[PDB]
Amino acid sequence: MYVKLISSDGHEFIVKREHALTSGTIKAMLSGTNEVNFREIPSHVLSKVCMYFTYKVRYTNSSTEIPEFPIAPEIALELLMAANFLDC
Amino acid sequence: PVLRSVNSREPSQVIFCNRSPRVVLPVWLNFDGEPQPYPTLPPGTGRRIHSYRGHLWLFRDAGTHDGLLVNQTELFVPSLNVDGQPIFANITLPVYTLKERCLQVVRSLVKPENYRRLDIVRSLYEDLEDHPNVQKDLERLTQE
Amino acid sequence: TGYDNREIVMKYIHYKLSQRGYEWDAGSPVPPVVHLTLRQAGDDFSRRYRRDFAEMSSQLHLTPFTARGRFATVVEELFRDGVNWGRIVAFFEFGGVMCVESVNREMSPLVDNIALWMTEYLNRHLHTWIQDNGGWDAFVELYGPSM
Amino acid sequence: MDVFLMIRRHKTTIFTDAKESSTVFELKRIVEGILKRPPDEQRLYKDDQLLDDGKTLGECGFTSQTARPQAPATVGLAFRADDTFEALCIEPFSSPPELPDVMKP
């Protein structure tokens, strides 16, 4: 089961429903068809949020060594605003 | 003070193993529960160190005091050395929330005197200047 | 009332370091016979218990990040049963070997910290007992017969 | 050994994972479940190189250390309209703004 997250600039990101539910905001946005539009999050930010969804589900409760989640300086502030809105 | 070392006087050989990209600050809580800093560990290095049974350790980013994990948990307690084997204290990154990781990066790029010049909501100003600190984290674990 | 415990620490540590060739730098009136009595009483303790003096000078393992805990650990155990004069003499003599072994391991900045911890513990955890037992004046005459 | 990928076509990006022992046709199969297009209508790409439906993802280059969850490898997807295959076209992500002043070293 997948979900389509749509960025402000029209990019469609097809992520697994389990990964997207990392965000409690996206959880409520789907529980009220399997799509949701982020009129404020551009594709260069929303693509990085989905990478975090993959990273978080991969390494949570994993005994192996955990790599750093990288954040380029030019997206750090926009990504923080997005993380604050999405609560993840 | 429920989070303290126990003066057992029983040695415990431990190996601090830094499996993280950070420079790790070992933090020993003395018998009164006060944290004490020990020499840091560069990324990917290990040290055989002399500790004692029933002591309390926690591990931090030496530069930013970001919380780290040790054997997938908050605190490490040395135990009995069986068969002459040292106890491994595998220090790893936790899986930070996206928000906290973003706060780490923005903190590393902006002086604290300029946090409030960023065009973000006022709540994120408080989050940015709410730097991770051993004391407040110690008191959180106490109420658990 | 009472004497200045800080000067008693400074004068004693400066004497203990001079016994090994080290000169100490950075750093109510006490009579002169109080200092010279603690000198002889401390040197007398160390000769009588050179076994404990030797194992202590060896098993210190002083580093700047353990020196504080080492002091408090030994001092708490020293007065764990109670306070008397001989254990106060051993208290100064223990602070002496930590200052000596500090300079041995090229950690002379620790001498200032040890002096401060000794002064703190005197003014805070021994002053009530000392003054309730005749002060330092009572101590000089308990050692009087030995000079 | 798991690789993590972004399957991209035009303004679509599929975040999925597969094994290195998995083959390009098997990757075309999971695309079919998501986008409802059979593998015979799918061309897959790594940069500008069409992938054979029998080559394993490891042979093409997708390894554990070049397709990580925090930096997934990009796979280009091209669909067949009727008879002719469409050329691969991927619209780039938006650009970040200029780095604000208090964030410049």
Numbering used by the authors:
A (entry chain C): 17 to 48, 57 to 112
B (entry chain A): 61 to 204
C (entry chain D): 7 to 33, 87 to 206
D (entry chain B): 1 to 105
Please give sentences taken from the publication describing this entry.
Overexpression of BCL-xL and BCL-2 play key roles in tumorigenesis and cancer drug resistance. PROTACs are heterobifunctional molecules comprising two different ligands connected via an intervening linker. 753b is a VHL-based PROTAC and we were interested in elucidating the molecular basis by which 753b induces targeted degradation of BCL-xL/BCL-2 through formation of VHL/753b/BCL-xL and VHL/753b/BCL-2 ternary complexes, respectively. For our structural studies, a complex of VHL, Elongin C, and Elongin B (hereafter referred to as VCB) was used as the E3 substrate receptor subcomplex, as VHL is unstable when expressed alone.
Notably, the alkyl chain linker of 753b collapses to bring the VHL ligand very close to α4 helix of BCL-2, in proximity of the BH1 domain. The ternary complex interface shared between 753b, BCL-2 and VHL can be divided into three sets of interacting residues. Interestingly, all the BCL-2 contributing residues reside on the α4 helix. This hydrophobic patch is supported by the thiazol-benzyl moiety of 753b. The second set of interactions is shared between G128, T132 of BCL-2, F91 of VHL and the alkyl chain of the linker. H115 of VHL participates in hydrogen bonds with the oxygen of amide moiety of linker (closer to VHL ligand) and with the PROTAC. Consistent with the structure, E136A/G128R and E136A/G128R/F124L mutations in BCL-2 that are predicted to disrupt the ternary complex exhibited a complete lack of polyubiquitin chain formation (Lane 9 and 10).
